[PDB]
């Protein structure tokens, strides 16, 4: 494809690492809501 495909893959790996770090920080700082269904008949 492009001339910079390897660099794009390296950037994607770095972005995955950044996403992992951000997810951990969110779990340890913010208030994540838990989704639950009452499953009521009405």
């Amino acid at each position: 494809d492009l001339e910079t495909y390897v660099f794009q893959d390296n950037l994607a790996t770095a972005m995955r690492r950044d996403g992992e770090i951000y997810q951990s920080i969110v779990n340890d700082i913010y208030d994540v809501p838990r989704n639950v269904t009452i499953t009521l008949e009405d």
Binding site: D1, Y5, V6, D9
Partner: protein
């Protein structure tokens, strides 16, 4: 003694092209059930 020693490379682009070509086609292991077994024998193992 100290003399001029240049480095005019011509082979690095070939290696770069080959690694870029092999990076564009990822390969991973696919488990398939044996012929005599059930159709879904390799579901939980594949997910794991």
């Amino acid at each position: 003694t100290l003399q001029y020693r240049g480095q005019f490379d011509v082979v690095r682009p070939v290696v770069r092209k080959l690694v870029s070509e092999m990076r564009q086609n990822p390969i991973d292991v696919l488990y398939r059930p044996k012929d005599g077994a059930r159709p879904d024998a390799a579901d939980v193992l594949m997910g794991m």
